[PDB]
């Protein structure tokens, strides 16, 4: 279905992008053969001294030219992932039969759509291109929540997946609005490691820091916004020793990481 | 399934081609190496110009081969992406229950191997590279068709899936045929634009072009060629628009593009 | 679902890799115009030879550094790759039903995470990165035989795919303990060849191989390991070709590689 067509357009990125690199291997290594063949013939200092400030000025044109075409083909890669994204979570919201979560589940198709958009008109913006990254994986976060609901008909799922699509949409309607904002950019990863978890302690904690920086953002106090990272910080630190300590370990890191995540969430309500 | 198969094949090819890049770039690196070496020891002017020559004539060849190694990736790349378009032609062939659909998707698969093969045998061919490109735009667009026919069981859907993945048959074989031909080139690209759509006057409008072109080439008159690829041409620009306006704009430019290939329509039949 | 998510990981990585190409190619270009500027510039002889010697020098690192770059991007693609295999190898487990092949499946998944857990570790070893794609080959081998165990219910293909999933966890842990052993590295892939062919003549010969380089490998007898790579090498040779022949041909070599195949393992056993 759509998954090959993504696959497909992702590939003649690549290729491409490897045809662009060699262009400009091909061009740098004309310009060191010209100098090397005028710096040998010619005897004027002051002309060979030109020759070499041209190219080194072309050398360092050809490079930039380079960077921005990786940097367009980050934002086109961007785009073609963020949408297959949302394409699968207004399908799977579909297969739950909430016209609640369907009308959650195209707000994400609209806020997909628009940052996507945003990204690949000026793909040389760093904030634009962070922001997107997230706003994928909160996406992704949101479809794993939503096949999740669907397997075994758990009513506790099916609202557990309500509440953390919800929570994405709200993590990234604040991103989308402050790209540059470091507490709003570590809210949204803290979430999505609290969608994986499924905890319900984490993920309103996690929720509670999202609208702790939107509130912070609403205003301009600066020293508002890195309370809330330094407590988004720790939070996600703590999720992410809570899935390595259940994945692996022995048990023992297990407990200990529970009280982590249950401190780090004390000192932010 | 076979999705996560071309994945990996494909995910082989770019660090392989990635691999081969840094093999060229290593290889220049030594020939400027050397050269200045030995343009800074020597001093007679003849043995200087010939150490330079032989390796702005090596340098060419490095670069060469390293545009044939992407030449052959692409191919191969091309090659599996339409091996995975056509498998997911045939079932959702199957999962229509027409017999005789079942037998059109069986030509594409046989028309996407026959056109596979031929591009990888000579990858420098650039007719017969961009031909396997739309032959996969085609048989994506009868899929995307043969999946929408099976959502509400529609009847006009499934014969509106049955006469444009027919019509994708016919603009696959022409191009197949004849690579470089425009006129056949840009008939089937109005008609994957006409298929998409879903419009009844735009399938059988695009069609028409695919025939006219498909009499045009019958015979070997190259203005007849040229006025088919200027209809078509119309026709594509059309529902290309028709396609952005009906996505976005504020309905104003929508009832415009509709009488675009109202009237493109009209002086092509 | 997951296939969407390791498509998007691929991609990071590819944009990631070609801009440390770029970087590469950026840096190697700025020694070579300073190395030309000192060379015109300066005179004693001495100065620049060491001028020029620690240009090769840096280059020759430059260029290592870029290789352990695609070294360590090609591992983490391998192990996207084989955990998404694994992933479909425990549902398609699910959708048959037996217990049995659950835990076969369930093994294969432990498989999977420890040998490509292994090859991200050390990235430069070569046995470790080709036993992991050996390994994912057969979760491939495996995934497909699964998938047709559940088309039409049939029991010789549903205990097919059991036969041949329990096949690729004996011919997994082989490879897994001993990864430079050729033996063993054959004999895998002798097994991946004979699942897709359907044959149990050609299973069970496979399988007997696989035995048969296991006990090589339990002593060190180097001679006894070569016999068994030797016999395993013709036996997958052989069922190369009759795909081919399959696939294409005219149905006269056809007959020719069953007796090919049949040979082969008449002195294999």
């Known amino acids: 279905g759509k998954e090959l067509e993504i696959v497909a357009r992702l590939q003649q990125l690549n290729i491409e992008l490897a045809r662009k690199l060699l262009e400009a291997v091909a061009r740098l ?3 060191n053969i010209d100098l090397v063949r005028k710096t040998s013939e010619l005897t004027d200092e002051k002309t060979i001294r030109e020759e070499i400030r ?10 930039e030219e380079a960077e921005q075409e990786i940097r367009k083909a980050e934002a086109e890669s961007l785009r073609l992932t963020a949408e297959a994204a949302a394409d ?6 579909l297969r739950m039969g909430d016209e609640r979560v369907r009308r959650l589940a195209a707000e994400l198709v609209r806020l997909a759509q628009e940052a996507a958009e945003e ?3 000026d793909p040389n913006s760093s904030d634009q291109n962070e922001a997107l990254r997230l706003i994928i994986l909160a996406i992704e976060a949101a479809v794993r ?4 609901a669907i397997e075994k ?6 609202e557990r997946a309500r509440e953390m699509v919800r929570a994405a949409v709200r993590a990234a309607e604040l991103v989308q609005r402050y790209p540059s904002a470091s507490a709003a950019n570590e809210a949204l990863k803290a979430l999505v490691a609290a969608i994986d978890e499924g905890d319900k302690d984490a993920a309103r904690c996690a929720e509670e820091l999202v609208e702790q920086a939107e509130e912070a953002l609403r205003k301009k106090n600066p020293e508002e916004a890195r309370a809330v990272y330094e407590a988004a910080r720790d939070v996600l630190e703590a999720l992410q020793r809570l899935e390595e300590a259940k994945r692996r370990g022995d048990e023992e890191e297990r407990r200990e990481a529970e009280e982590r995540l249950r401190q780090a969430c004390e000192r932010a309500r």
Chains 1, 2, 3 share one sequence.
Do not use: F, M, N
């Not at 929540?145 to 999740?148: I, N, S, V």
């Not at 008909?153 to 099916?158: A, L, M, N």
């Open 29 to 31: 290594q004309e310009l």
């Open 153 to 158: 008909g758990d009513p506790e799922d099916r």
């Open 88 to 93: 699968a979570a207004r399908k799977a919201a």
């Open 119 to 121: 990204a690949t008109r």
């Open 54 to 63: 041209k190219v080194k000025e072309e050398s360092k044109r050809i490079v």
């Open 145 to 148: 929540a939503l096949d999740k």
